[PDB]
Design a protein around this ligand. Structure first.
Ligand SMILES: CC(C)=CCC/C(C)=C/CC/C(C)=C/CONC(=O)CP(=O)(O)O
Ligand SMILES: [Cl-]
Ligand SMILES: [Cl-]
Ligand SMILES: [Cl-]
Ligand SMILES: [Zn+2]
Lengths: 5, 335, 452
């Protein structure tokens, strides 16, 4: 799982 | 609906969602929000528009966070309310710890922690179980980037570079997994990171200098450097293909103004090859610090081993290094 | 197994330490999931398989996935509320890469972002959310891709400038929103919005950062980014954090908005340590990039790490003159073959969409950035002495041009193992949209007087 903000 | 039926909320009218649908063409990537979330957020719009600092607004922010902890606006408004009302931030941290334990990879929870903990009026010194809470997080994900970022801030804020739990917690994480690069990175900050409170924070010393000298310490504690290099060698011997301690040692030598050739014999001991990092170390020693006698050819041989056998996906970078060494050697032969 | 697949992509690495830790367990699991897909023998894979043993890009499947991703989501997707502008951007960018004309989305983009714009300036995740530089970046890039005067007109440029000026910090960086965190995303997203909207370089006269002696949006900024390099050579999100490919992209792309790559990047970064750390992001046999040392490959780094390469390569090659004779290039310093294998063999989902890695469901973020990285390998991207900007500030950023790097035949260290049938539209390495879209919005704004 990738999160950018 | 919970807010609209509560007389606690009677004195304020919610602001309905306007997402642009039935004010034109239909909007994109819409979410069919639950009734509870639609209602809560419509009350949040109203309180924020009024700049309301109140206990009810504080409870509303906690409710919205329970539904969507990635709502960045509600966390910032929560922190405004906590400070405006003089709330007990020890109690806020105990609530935040529960949220943090429920949700991973989240910018807001760890930014909010830094907002609260930065208040010296409330937290004049490191709280007594703060390091243990960070270790609760690292037991679940030892490489959690936002928790390590918070711990770097905590070390600078409370001046913890020489605090024994910082090194002990890094060593416990490296005993559990010597390949934990996040722990190696924090080790570099504790040992070699800049500490001058009158300068902006940096990952490396000497960022006002030429970029080739970035990292150079103004004053070198030679015994500390020796100790950290010995520690690095001991960890390498447990798992010689682990990049992290090799990179850490390069960083220590750069900080100290010492050459890679200090480890020439150690690197040769792995070369029948037990470490690709040892081969790259040797290529650099022969290329960059040896001005002799076939040293250029030996560097090229090491890079050829990397490109053909031991790290072939990086062939184009090894060949770029071969071209640089060959040009340099040609320049040497020329003069 | 197909004869066109080299052993490097069919076997684990030669050297293997005896000690098992969680890092090696996860690395080994990832290699073992990727191997049947790299070899082209997994029953989830659709052909045709090319001469290098690699499946086609499943264009129709991905188009349908990206169009569907623009429609409505159920309540369970509430955590994406703050990310709605991103979901618009990722889908439009994937559709553009795949060769769609996204003009027909102009009205729906206008509808979506009109509601998310705050009257005090900037764009947030949606009605009632405070402005955030990431949602403003996503919205501006979306507006650029759909184009048209009506979309460009929606943005309140003066209020955007006032709000972005509030984010400028004493140390030269930017927070991502008022009261939010400071990291290199803030800097890169703020400066891309600033550049594409041709905002004034000077800070608003009331900007707090003026009290700390700063005068313009770029004052103290490359120095701040230099302070995010780490001992490993890579670049972290904020000073002292761990080097990471996503933050290296933000920092290097932001440096290239400040001047020519061969001036700014070697001045503020130690290239001697940056280059090997960037090279070390790529693994075999997977072929893709990881974000940080001792972690796993992931298809979204095909953009964050992959698009660092044209920036670093330009810093080493220098600006290409349109008049002068062709100069020598350092070429590609990573394996285009490896990256292409990882994206096409390992990151395509049989039902459409692309993913982080085998075993993960797709999403439109991974679909956008795996496609973006596949496009990068298909072009020479370089900066020139010919800019579409009429002004000096960001002149180099508007000078980037592209030539196709055509599909190859034969073995080699720097080869194109996609087919030409897999060719995507080129994207600008700093703005992450088609060059013409970035050009058109910048030039339109350059020709508008700044609002009173
Ligand atoms: C323009 C934007 C918004 C750039 C930022 C994009 C990325 C992907 C931010 C990365 C931040 C990151 C280090 C988050 C922490 O969690 N993510 C991981 O741990 C993933 P990995 O294991 O690949 O590091
Ligand atoms: Cl200062
Ligand atoms: Cl707001
Ligand atoms: Cl699949
Ligand atoms: Zn990812």
């Amino acid at each position: 799982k990738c999160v950018v903000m | 609906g919970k807010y609209s039926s509560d007389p606690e909320w009677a004195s304020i009218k919610p602001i309905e969602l306007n997402d642009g649908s039935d004010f034109g063409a239909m909007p994109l990537a819409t979410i069919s929000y639950s009734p509870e979330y639609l209602e809560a957020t419509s009350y949040l719009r109203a309180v924020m528009a009024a700049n309301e600092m109140s206990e009810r607004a504080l409870r509303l922010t906690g409710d919205i966070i329970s539904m969507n902890p990635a709502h960045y606006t509600v966390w910032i408004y929560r922190a405004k309310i906590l400070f405006a009302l003089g709330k007990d931030l020890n109690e806020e941290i105990e609530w935040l710890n529960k949220v943090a334990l429920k949700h991973l990879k989240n910018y807001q929870i760890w930014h909010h922690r830094q907002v609260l903990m930065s208040s010296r009026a409330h937290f004049p010194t490191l709280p007594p179980r703060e390091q243990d809470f960070l270790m609760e997080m690292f037991a679940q994900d030892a490489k959690s980037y936002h928790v390590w970022t918070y711990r770097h801030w905590l070390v600078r804020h409370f001046k913890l570079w020489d605090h024994p739990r910082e090194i002990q917690d890094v060593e416990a994480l490296l005993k559990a997994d010597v390949r934990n690069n996040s722990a190696w990175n924090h080790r570099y900050m504790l040992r070699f990171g800049p500490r001058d409170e009158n300068e902006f924070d940096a990952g490396l010393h000497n960022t006002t200098g030429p970029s080739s000298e970035k990292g150079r310490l103004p004053v070198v504690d030679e015994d500390l450097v020796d100790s950290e290099l010995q520690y690095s060698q001991s960890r390498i011997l447990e798992a010689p293909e682990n990049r992290s301690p090799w990179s850490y040692a390069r960083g220590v030598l750069q900080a100290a103004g010492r050459p890679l050739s200090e480890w020439k014999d150690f690197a040769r001991s792995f070369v029948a090859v037990k470490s690709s990092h040892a081969i790259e170390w040797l290529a650099d020693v022969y290329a960059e610090e040896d001005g002799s006698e076939g040293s250029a050819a030996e560097a090229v041989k090491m890079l050829t081993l990397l490109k053909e056998k031991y790290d072939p996906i990086r062939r184009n970078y090894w060949e770029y290094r071969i071209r640089q060494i060959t040009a340099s050697a040609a320049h040497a032969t020329e003069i | 197994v197909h004869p066109g697949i080299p052993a490097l992509f069919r076997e684990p690495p030669l050297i293997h330490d005896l000690l098992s830790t969680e890092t090696t367990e996860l690395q080994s699991e990832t290699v073992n999931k990727c191997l049947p897909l790299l070899k082209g023998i997994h029953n989830s894979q659709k052909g045709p398989f090319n001469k290098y043993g690699i499946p086609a890009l499943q264009r129709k499947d991905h188009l349908e996935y990206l169009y569907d991703s623009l429609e409505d989501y159920p309540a369970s997707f509430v955590a994406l509320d703050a990310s709605r502008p991103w979901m618009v951007y990722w889908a439009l960018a994937g559709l553009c890469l795949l060769g769609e004309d996204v003009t027909r989305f102009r009205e729906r983009v206008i509808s979506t972002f009109t509601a998310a714009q705050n009257s005090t300036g900037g764009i947030g995740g949606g009605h009632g959310q405070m402005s955030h530089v990431a949602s403003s970046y996503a919205a501006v890039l979306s507006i650029a891709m759909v184009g048209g005067e009506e979309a460009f007109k929606l943005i309140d440029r003066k209020a955007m400038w006032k709000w972005l000026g509030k984010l400028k910090q004493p140390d030269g960086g930017f927070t991502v929103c008022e009261g939010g965190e400071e990291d290199v995303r803030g800097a890169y997203c703020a400066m891309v919005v600033h550049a594409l909207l041709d905002l004034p370089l000077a800070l608003p006269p009331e900007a707090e950062a003026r009290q700390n002696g700063l005068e313009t949006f770029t004052d103290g900024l490359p120095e701040y980014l230099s302070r995010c390099q780490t001992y490993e050579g890579g670049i972290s999100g904020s000073p002292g954090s761990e080097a990471h490919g996503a933050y290296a992209f933000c920092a290097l792309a932001c440096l290239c908005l400040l001047g020519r790559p061969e001036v700014v990047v070697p001045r503020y970064m130690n290239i001697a340590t940056l280059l090997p750390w960037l090279s070390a992001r790529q693994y075999a046999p997977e072929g893709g990039f990881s974000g940080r040392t001792n972690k796993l490959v992931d298809g979204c780094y095909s953009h964050w790490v992959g698009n660092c390469w044209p920036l670093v390569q330009a810093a080493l090659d220098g600006t290409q003159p349109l008049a002068g004779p062709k100069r020598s290039s350092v070429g590609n310093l990573y394996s285009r073959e490896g990256l292409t294998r990882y994206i096409l063999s390992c990151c395509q989902c049989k039902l459409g969409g692309l993913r982080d890695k085998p075993g993960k469901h797709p999403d439109s973020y991974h679909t956008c950035y795996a496609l973006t990285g596949l496009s990068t390998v298909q072009y020479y991207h370089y900066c020139t002495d010919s800019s579409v900007s009429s002004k000096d500030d960001f002149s180099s950023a508007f000078s980037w041009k592209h030539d196709p790097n055509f599909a190859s035949d034969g073995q080699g260290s720097d080869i194109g193992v996609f087919t030409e049938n897999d060719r995507l539209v080129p994207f600008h390495p700093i703005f992450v949209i088609p060059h013409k879209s970035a050009e058109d919005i910048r030039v339109w704004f350059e020709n508008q007087s700044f609002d009173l």
